[PDB]
Amino acid sequence: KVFGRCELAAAMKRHGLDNYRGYSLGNWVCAAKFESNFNTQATNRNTDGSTDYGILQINSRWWCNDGRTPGSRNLCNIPCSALLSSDITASVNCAKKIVSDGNGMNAWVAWRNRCKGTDVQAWIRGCRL
């Protein structure tokens, strides 16, 4: 599913990400913009052979099982395919686990490099939340 910016903001809020671990909703929407272009079905292979899945490009190296990432974990206890659903529950719940792991949203390099320290509230500008 390709979410609209404001639609995704509202869903994310409904799923309790606004200000989760201190990160306002714009941070989350910004991250999703640059990780996946708001597409739930986005996937990307990394150089180590792990794969990133879904609107926040969560990696099979630590967080989900895809059966083809040797020596990986599955900390959100989910199949990676669950991160591709039009329903963002698995992605949100797994992201809450990631962002709570110690390094906050710096876990997402696209967030660090393109959202961190910017005016992220622009990403929710105009939205009925």
Swiss-Prot record:
Catalysed reaction, written as an equation: Hydrolysis of (1->4)-beta-linkages between N-acetylmuramic acid and N-acetyl-D-glucosamine residues in a peptidoglycan and between N-acetyl-D-glucosamine residues in chitodextrins
Enzyme Commission code: 3.2.1.17
Disulphide-bonded residues: C6-C127, C30-C115, C64-C80, C76-C94
One biological process term in Gene Ontology: cell wall macromolecule catabolic process
InterPro entries the record matches: Glyco_hydro_22, Glyco_hydro_22_CS, Glyco_hydro_22_lys, Lysozyme-like_dom_sf
Family annotation (PROSITE patterns): GLYCOSYL_HYDROL_F22_1, GLYCOSYL_HYDROL_F22_2
Gene Ontology cellular-component terms listed: cytoplasm; endoplasmic reticulum; extracellular space
Entry coiled-coil feature ranges: none
Binding site for substrate: D101
GO function terms (MF aspect): beta-N-acetylglucosaminidase activity; identical protein binding; lysozyme activity
Tissue-specific expression: In the egg white and polymorphonuclear leukocytes.
Active-site residues (renumbered): E35, D52
Keywords linked to the UniProt accession: Allergen, Antimicrobial, Bacteriolytic enzyme, Disulfide bond, Glycosidase, Hydrolase, Secreted, Signal
C-type lysozyme domain boundaries: 1-129
Localisation: Secreted
Its job: Lysozymes have primarily a bacteriolytic function; those in tissues and body fluids are associated with the monocyte-macrophage system and enhance the activity of immunoagents. Has bacteriolytic activity against M.luteus.
Additional remarks: Lysozyme C is capable of both hydrolysis and transglycosylation; it also shows a slight esterase activity. It acts rapidly on both peptide-substituted and unsubstituted peptidoglycan, and slowly on chitin oligosaccharides.
Quaternary data: Monomer.
Similarity comment text for this entry: Belongs to the glycosyl hydrolase 22 family.
Name of the molecule in the record: Lysozyme C
Lineage per the UniProt record: Eukaryota, Metazoa, Chordata, Craniata, Vertebrata
Gene: LYZ
